[PDB]
Amino acid sequence: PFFPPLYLGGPEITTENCEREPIHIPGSIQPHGALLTADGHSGEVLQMSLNAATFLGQEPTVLRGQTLAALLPEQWPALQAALPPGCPDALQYRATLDWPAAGHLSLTVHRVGELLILEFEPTEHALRNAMFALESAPNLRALAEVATQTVRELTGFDRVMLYKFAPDATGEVIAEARREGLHAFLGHRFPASDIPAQARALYTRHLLRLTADTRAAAVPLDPVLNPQTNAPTPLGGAVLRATSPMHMQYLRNMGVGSSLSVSVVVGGQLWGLIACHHQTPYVLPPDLRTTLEYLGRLLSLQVQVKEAADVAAFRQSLREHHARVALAAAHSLSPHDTLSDPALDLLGLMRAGGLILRFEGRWQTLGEVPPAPAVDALLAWLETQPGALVQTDALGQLWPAGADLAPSAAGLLAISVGEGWSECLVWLRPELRLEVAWGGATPDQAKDDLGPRHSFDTYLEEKRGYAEPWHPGEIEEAQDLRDTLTGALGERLSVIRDLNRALTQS
Amino acid sequence: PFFPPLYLGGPEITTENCEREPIHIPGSIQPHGALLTADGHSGEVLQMSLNAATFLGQEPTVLRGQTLAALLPEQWPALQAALPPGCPDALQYRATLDWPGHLSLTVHRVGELLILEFEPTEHALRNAMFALESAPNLRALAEVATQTVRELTGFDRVMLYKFAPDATGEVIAEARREGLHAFLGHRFPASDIPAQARALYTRHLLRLTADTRAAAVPLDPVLNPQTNAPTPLGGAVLRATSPMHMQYLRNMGVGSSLSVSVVVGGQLWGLIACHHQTPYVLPPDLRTTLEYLGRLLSLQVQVKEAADVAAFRQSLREHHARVALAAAHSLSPHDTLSDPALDLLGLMRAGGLILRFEGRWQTLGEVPPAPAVDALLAWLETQPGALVQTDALGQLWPAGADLAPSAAGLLAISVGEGWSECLVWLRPELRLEVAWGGATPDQAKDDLGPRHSFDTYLEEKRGYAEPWHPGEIEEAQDLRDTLTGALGERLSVIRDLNRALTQS
Ligand SMILES: C=CC1=C(C)/C(=C/C2=[NH+]C(=C\c3[nH]c(/C=C4\NC(=O)[C@@H](C)\C4=C/C)c(C)c3CCC(=O)O)/C(CCC(=O)O)=C2C)NC1=O
Ligand SMILES: C=CC1=C(C)/C(=C/C2=[NH+]C(=C\c3[nH]c(/C=C4\NC(=O)[C@@H](C)\C4=C/C)c(C)c3CCC(=O)O)/C(CCC(=O)O)=C2C)NC1=O
């Protein structure tokens, strides 16, 4: 639930109440364009940006109280065709204008409810080569390099980087291209507090936003409330939408003049950003932004292709080792024997230190394992767990009672044959020395200050109770075992009923 | 395995030996450009198209025996950067030239060789991209595509052609000129698009025929002297069309062709296929626009299909959720999955059902006679996977072609493995009429060349049923997991029964 905005009457936003900021309703725009709201039926003007009078070059007595039919005679018929009543608010329409007072204008329109938002901005063979270059990258780190070079070339920005999210919403810079004699942010990881959750929800909907100037003063809308609904006007799909005042402070301390980002969306989920900085105030032309929007879409396809090629490659190293195992667990009638032979080796398939088997109603260990009573502690925890696969790199965090059992078991991968964890397998990876290079500060040191942090330098933190993280192609290998074992469970039942049959008869 | 080409010494291609035609090595180009092959290291010219002398406007004594350094001084450095040794042959590079009019040069590398293609040259795409992303369903998306493509290209007919899992295609959307025939809805055999052609159209994603009544222009010398072998022209756009397919478009009465491949998750999904009545040449800078749209579509197909399934499966929400709870605590499936209060016949819109647990079978609804049940089950045990899905049973199993009245359609899942325990939904026989565009699959192997008729043809199909909506197959595979999942509890219990009866 969001707090009301400042103009209506709401509380002051700090680091504590961050999630509850109405970013999508600022009631203000960035001062390098003009904004008009009109009725989606009559064509009568309802709101103006305060700067619109001069930018379009007319007396505001005339603008307030006029039809879109009289202002844009060539466009108003064309506009009503493209955006019919009851259309998604993500749908946009663009056209170019020859306004004599200014010169050349680029008009961008979209519909929200019974309302039209109008955005005005001044305006005036490599993309084909770039598209073909992305499709012929070998791996993923190769694809991310081609992206950053290509974007820096077109835009002429100081720094361009590809920023990728983890499943816990802390991001990592995976590739970077910059000007010479500058700091390097590559490899650095960042907390889940820099990008709030409602902002992540927005960046899945609309796929581009920017800040032309970080030291700019915002321009209000008049009248401030939409008189149709007597409510604040939603500016989510508007590009001239003023930036959140909190984030503006952040870019000042990092010492940035201008920002831009394009969202990468894989299968209806936010995957990462392409984030650009410049040292000085800098305005990108609107016809160049369009090129960036195509590249965002091309990437969103090629991310899928390269990731699925990385897994298939890895899993072709473990081919014969997989195939002999799969044959041995498909004819097993006693798993406590066939899955314990060192001649098969289940420790090497997963590159694990130890293993805990559990079938029938007992348990048996291979390799390097915790002491005996501590095994029964671990298993007791797994029975409460929801799914059919539990995967962790740090065990001490998920389970604090087993934070002392790091030397043998820091890492864990567990699969449940059948359901309920009556029967399972558990691979164990030992403790490792870990050093994570945080860009700025650790997650605990992001909630101390009333505003953003000052330091953005390379920070080293020693993490304890961590292990070697699981390659995704190994998790895919495990889930294929989990199927074979659960599959041949039917034969096991079959037999025992026939045993039961005799012993009922006796 | 392919036959050798005509110039080396191979057999004449007919309808019998179609799969064995070397399409990717014709040794000829379409006469509206020029083609040069050069060494990828020295830059020395090795092959010319016979028409190249005049098109580029030079004496062929000069062209043969020259460097690319002397011909394109501004390009030769730039070209060696873009295409390094050992790069995929799908990678392309383009640039524009001011030849005393204007030329568009397109280059790609195959092995130790460079292919050069020459062609003459001289705000809506942004609107189209946004319109595709805001389409409600799939048939709505396919309509936006066909309108948008007809507008830019100005072609007579544009249509989206989608493949079935058996490689017979169906026209799902269409936009055309007025006073013309309508191909929409018509289905076509798996013999019109051969299999090696399908293999090619997954690699390179555009091809065209500028003129159907054109004579092909040969290459000189005809064999690449580097390898003493025919020069591969797969990635070349000026590549001459197969002579068989040229005959086909003449009988359909087409002047010019173009197609763009739609590729979903490393598989061919469909084509965008365009015709014109007269010879017509598309400019190269307009083709580039079409190539972007092909890529945009290939993403949006995925989004709209996954939205169609999720929509359907939200109608069957409570009916699914009650069932899933009942088969997760079952200790006797022969009881809990037989109550009409649960109803498994309605979840799948089926006429009948055959259950099988323990070691016997029990039926609900409308089912075949008793000895014929044991015929059907005997067949399922030989079947490979864990799900068998068919609309026509008589084709997959000819011994049960007589059991159409009760069981024309089938969907069977195997709890566990081996078909010891399974469930089988049955759909009854239905009157079916399929509108073939031209002729049926049996009437495509008679003639020595292509067919003449392309009119609406009606065939009465017998032994067919209502086909399964994909959201129903997704519903079935989620049951197959619950039943197999709770098999563990079933075993657990019986061992403890066994425990007592061992003790006695
Ligand atoms: C090296 C990589 C890197 C990182 C990790 C990074 C983060 C980052 N923040 C972003 C946005 C926002 N952040 C906050 C708020 C807070 N964030 C904090 O730190 C505290 C003080 C806080 C609240 C108490 C809000 C409200 C917004 C939404 C702004 C709007 O849409 O109006 C964006 C997207 C915008 C863009 O691309 O320029 C990025 C990419 N900036 C970098 O360059
Ligand atoms: C209304 C829908 C409709 C259909 C179904 C249709 C067919 C069709 N076949 C295509 C291609 C080829 N066909 C054949 C050969 C044969 N075709 C036959 O019928 C028999 C005689 C036969 C061999 C025994 C060969 C070698 C090729 C490869 C061409 C090459 O790449 O050189 C293409 C794609 C190319 C394009 O769009 O132009 C289409 C779209 N034309 C339509 O517009």
Measure the CA angle with vertex A53, ends A47 and A59; round to 5°.
105
Q: Is B262 exposed, middle or buried (0-12, 13-18, 19+ CB in 10 A)?
A: buried
Whose atoms come closest to the Cα of B449: which ligand?
2
User: Can you tell me which residue has the tokens 């084509």?
Assistant: B271
Q: Quick check: helix, strand or coil at residue A202?
A: helix
Q: Is A79 exposed, middle or buried (0-12, 13-18, 19+ CB in 10 A)?
A: buried
User: Can you tell me which residue has the tokens 């999508």?
Assistant: A24
The answer to whether B405 and A478 have CB atoms below 8 angstroms apart is no
Q: Quick one: CA dihedral A270, A274, A277, A278, positive or negative? A: negative
The answer to whether B452 and B251 have CB atoms below 8 angstroms apart is yes
Q: Taking the C-alpha atoms of A82, A83, A87 and A93 in order, what is their torsion angle to the nearest 10 degrees? A: 80
- How many whole angstroms separate alpha carbon A500 and alpha carbon B16? 61
Q: Is B473 exposed, middle or buried (0-12, 13-18, 19+ CB in 10 A)?
A: middle
CATH class of the domain at A1-124+217-244: alpha beta
Flag whether residue B491 sits within 8 Å of chain A, measured between CB atoms: yes
Which of chain A's residues have a Cβ under 8 Å away from the Cβ of B415? 490
The answer to whether A125 and A272 have CB atoms below 8 angstroms apart is no
CA A77 to the chain's CA centroid: 39
Radius of gyration of chain A (CA): 30
Q: Which of A180, A139, A140, A188 is nearest to A158 (CA)?
A: A180
CATH architecture classification, A320-431+467-505: 2-Layer Sandwich (3.30)
Question: Which residue among B248, B258, B272 is best mutated to probe the pocket of ligand 2, counting the most ligand atoms within 8 A of its Cβ?
Answer: B248
Q: What is the phi-psi region of residue A373: left when phi exceeds 0, alpha when psi lies from -120 to 50, beta otherwise?
A: alpha
- DSSP H/E element including B116: strand B113-120
Beta-bridged to residue A220, according to DSSP, are A28
- How many whole angstroms separate alpha carbon A139 and alpha carbon A174? 13
Chain B: residue nearest A291 by CA?
B126
Interface list for B 65-104 with A (CB within 8 A): 82, 87-88, 90-96
Q: Quick check: helix, strand or coil at residue A297?
A: helix
Which of chain A's residues have a Cβ under 8 Å away from the Cβ of B498? 496, 499-500, 503
The answer to whether A489 and B487 have CB atoms below 8 angstroms apart is yes
User: Can you tell me which residue has the tokens 């671990």?
Assistant: A378
CATH number given to B125-212+253-311: 3.30.450.40
C-alpha separations of B94 from A64, A418, B30, B47, B161 in Å: 51, 57, 20, 20, 30
User: Can you tell me which residue has the tokens 């306004």?
Assistant: A99
Please give the single-letter amino acid code of residue A486: T
CATH number given to A126-214+255-313: 3.30.450.40
Flag whether residue B489 sits within 8 Å of chain A, measured between CB atoms: yes
C-alpha separations of B131 from A157, A270, B142 in Å: 30, 21, 12
Ranges of H-type helices in A162-241: 197-202
Q: Do the chains contact at B484 and A500, CB–CB below 8 Å?
A: no
Chain B: residue nearest A419 by CA?
B485
Write the DSSP assignment of B271-318 as a string of letters: EEEEEESS-----HHHHHHHHHHHHHHHHHHHHHHHHHHHHHTTTSSH
- How many whole angstroms separate alpha carbon A443 and alpha carbon B400? 67
Ligand 2, closest atom to CA B23? 32
Secondary structure letter of residue B444 according to DSSP: G
Which of chain B's residues have a Cβ under 8 Å away from the Cβ of A293? 126, 129
- How many whole angstroms separate alpha carbon B261 and alpha carbon B84? 27
Q: Do the chains contact at A500 and B504, CB–CB below 8 Å?
A: no
The answer to whether B171 and B185 have CB atoms below 8 angstroms apart is yes
Ligand 1, closest atom to CA A14? 24
Flag whether residue A436 sits within 8 Å of chain B, measured between CB atoms: no
Ligand 2, closest atom to CA B240? 32
User: Can you tell me which residue has the tokens 């709201």?
Assistant: A37
A276 is in an annotated binding site: no
Q: Do the chains contact at B417 and A490, CB–CB below 8 Å?
A: yes
Ligand 1, closest atom to CA A452? 21
- How many whole angstroms separate alpha carbon A397 and alpha carbon A389? 17
Q: Least CB-CB distance to B487: which of A95, A305, A493?
A: A493
C-alpha separations of B106 from A263, B56, B62, B217, B260 in Å: 32, 15, 22, 19, 18
The answer to whether B456 and B435 have CB atoms below 8 angstroms apart is yes
Q: Which two tokens stand for residue B153?
A: 């290209």
The answer to whether B337 and B323 have CB atoms below 8 angstroms apart is no
Write the DSSP assignment of B47-99 as a string of letters: EEETTHHHHHTS-HHHHSS-BHHHH-TTTHHHHHHHS-SS--TT--EEEEE--
Secondary structure letter of residue B192 according to DSSP: S
Whose atoms come closest to the Cα of A28: which ligand?
1
C-alpha separations of A478 from A315, A355, A474, A481, B166 in Å: 11, 13, 6, 5, 32
The answer to whether A30 and A216 have CB atoms below 8 angstroms apart is yes
Q: Which two tokens stand for residue A212?
A: 């032309």
Asked whether B251 lines ligand 2 (CB < 6 A), one says: no
Beta-bridged to residue B328, according to DSSP, are none
Q: What is the phi-psi region of residue A86: left when phi exceeds 0, alpha when psi lies from -120 to 50, beta otherwise?
A: left
Q: Which two tokens stand for residue B115?
A: 């292919």
Q: Least CB-CB distance to A493: which of B123, B490, B504?
A: B490
Asked whether B163 lines ligand 2 (CB < 6 A), one says: no
Asked whether B49 lines ligand 2 (CB < 6 A), one says: no
Please give the single-letter amino acid code of residue B247: Q
Whose atoms come closest to the Cα of A238: which ligand?
1
Q: Which two tokens stand for residue A83?
A: 């955006």
Q: Do the chains contact at A422 and B492, CB–CB below 8 Å?
A: yes
- Give every CB contact of residue A380 below 8 A, 6+ residues apart in sequence: none
Q: Quick check: helix, strand or coil at residue A322?
A: helix
Please give the single-letter amino acid code of residue B204: H
Work out the minimum CA distance from B180 to partner chain A, whole angstroms: 27
Q: Going by CA atoms, what residue is nearest to atom 10 of ligand 1?
A: A195
The answer to whether B391 and A460 have CB atoms below 8 angstroms apart is no
Please give the single-letter amino acid code of residue A450: L
Q: Quick check: helix, strand or coil at residue B369?
A: coil
- How many whole angstroms separate alpha carbon A139 and alpha carbon A143? 6
Fold match, B1-122+217-242 / B125-212+253-311: yes
Which own/partner contact pairs does B287-290 have at CB distance under 8 Å and 24+ positions apart?
B287/B206, B288/A128, B289/B125, B289/B152, B290/B149, B290/B152, B290/B153, B290/B206, B290/B258, B290/B260
Q: Which of A154, A172, A152 is nearest to A163 (CA)?
A: A172
Q: Which two tokens stand for residue B5?
A: 């080409």
Beta-bridged to residue B437, according to DSSP, are B456
Secondary structure letter of residue A44 according to DSSP: B
Method: cryo-EM
- How many whole angstroms separate alpha carbon B38 and alpha carbon B118? 14
Work out the minimum CA distance from A158 to partner chain B, whole angstroms: 24
Residues with Cβ within 6 A of ligand 1? A 15, 18, 21, 23, 163, 171, 173, 185, 190, 193-196, 199, 209, 211, 243-244, 246-247, 250, 259, 261, 273, 275, 452
Q: How many CB pairs under 8 A join A and B?
A: 135
The answer to whether A259 and A214 have CB atoms below 8 angstroms apart is yes
Ligand 2, closest atom to CA B188? 5
Q: Taking the C-alpha atoms of B418, B423, B429 and B432 in order, what is their torsion angle to the nearest 10 degrees? A: -70
C-alpha separations of A164 from A146, A191, A294, A438, B430 in Å: 16, 12, 19, 15, 53
CATH class of the domain at B1-122+217-242: alpha beta
Beta-bridged to residue A261, according to DSSP, are A209, A275
Give the CA diameter of chain A.
Answer: 105
Q: Do the chains contact at B418 and A491, CB–CB below 8 Å?
A: yes
Flag whether residue B299 sits within 8 Å of chain A, measured between CB atoms: yes
- How many whole angstroms separate alpha carbon B313 and alpha carbon B348? 12
Q: Least CB-CB distance to A91: which of B134, B358, B490?
A: B134
Q: What are the E-state strand segments in A152-196?
A: 159-165, 171-178, 189-190
Interface list for A 365-394 with B (CB within 8 A): 388
Numbers of helices and strands, H then E, in chain B? 15, 22
- Spell out the domain ranges in chain B: 1-122+217-242, 125-212+253-311, 318-429+465-503
Radius of gyration of chain B (CA): 29
CATH architecture classification, B318-429+465-503: 2-Layer Sandwich (3.30)
Q: Do the chains contact at B418 and A128, CB–CB below 8 Å?
A: no
Q: Which of B219, B217, B225 is nearest to B44 (CA)?
A: B225
Q: Please count the CA atoms within 13 angstroms of the CA of B153 that sit on its side-chain side.
A: 33
A85 cis-preceded (ω within 30 degrees of 0)? no
Q: Please count the CA atoms within 13 angstroms of the CA of A281 that sit on its side-chain side.
A: 8
Beta-bridged to residue B159, according to DSSP, are B174, B273
Q: Quick check: helix, strand or coil at residue B486?
A: coil
Flag whether residue A455 sits within 8 Å of chain B, measured between CB atoms: no
A97, A359, A419, A479: best mutation site toward chain B, by most B Cβ within 10 Å? A419
- How many whole angstroms separate alpha carbon B366 and alpha carbon B427? 9
